[PDB]
Write a protein that binds this ligand. Structure first.
Ligand SMILES: COc1ccc(O[C@@H]2O[C@H](CO)[C@H](O[C@H]3O[C@H](CO)[C@H](O)[C@H](O)[C@H]3O)[C@H](O)[C@H]2O)cc1
Length: 197
């Protein structure tokens, strides 16, 4: 019987961007950099073997994801609008979604392999991801009615790699956008600024 195992390895690190003194007519800008490191399984869908013992062939399809909010609320209830300025080589998909950007990079497909492998790691299991992907540059638009004062806004987002192992050549699977949208947002960028006059 044909099988497909798909596992999402999630990266999770914290960083900050200090925007300094800002006026509502200006657009602060920050860069989201892909940070190789320890990833945690946060989702899977499997109906195949859990381990490949090196004696039989399977096929690999890997797709990196970044799911980033289009709007983030301040603690006092004002929207900050996140706008993509430079997506690099990323594929920007499902553009009609009102709440989140979906950036994908499918970099391996239809690759036959016999290497021993953990084909269906469980949520909570970890592994090192050494792959590097392109930066994404964002700009922020502040609402003109934003009250003056100090702002600290946590911008949570998801980044990670979907690994799909299959028993057959030509296998394709993309995590549904409605599932990707709700994957845990384990990365955080803390955006600090002061709205002045
Ligand atoms: C055998 O003929 C092929 C024609 C075109 C192909 O396209 C490649 O498919 C890959 C499948 O994993 C991968 O596409 C995935 O990722 C894209 C984002 O980078 C996008 O989301 C696609 O919808 C997704 O399927 C490569 O990027 C394509 O160039 C493969 C074989």
């Amino acid at each position: 019987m044909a099988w497909n195992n798909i596992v999402f390895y999630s990266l999770g690190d914290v960083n900050s961007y200090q925007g300094g003194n800002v006026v509502i007519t200006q657009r602060p800008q920050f860069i989201t950099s892909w940070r190789p490191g320890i990833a945690t399984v946060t989702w899977n869908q499997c109906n195949g073997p859990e381990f490949a013992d090196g004696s039989w062939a399977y096929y690999r399809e890997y797709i990196a994801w970044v799911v980033f909010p289009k709007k983030v609320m301040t603690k006092n209830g004002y929207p900050l609008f996140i706008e993509v300025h430079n997506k690099g080589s990323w594929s920007e998909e499902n553009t009609g979604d009102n709440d989140s950007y979906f950036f994908l990079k499918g970099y391996k497909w239809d690759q036959r392999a016999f290497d021993t492998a953990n084909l269906c790691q469980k949520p909570g299991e970890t592994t090192r991801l050494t792959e590097k992907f392109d930066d994404i540059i964002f700009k922020v638009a502040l609402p003109a009615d934003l009250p003056l004062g100090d702002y600290s806004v946590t911008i949570p987002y998801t980044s990670g790699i979907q690994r799909h192992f299959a028993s057959y050549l030509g296998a394709r699977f993309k995590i549904p956008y409605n599932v990707a949208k709700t994957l845990p947002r384990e990365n955080e960028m803390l955006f600090l600024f002061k709205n002045i006059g």
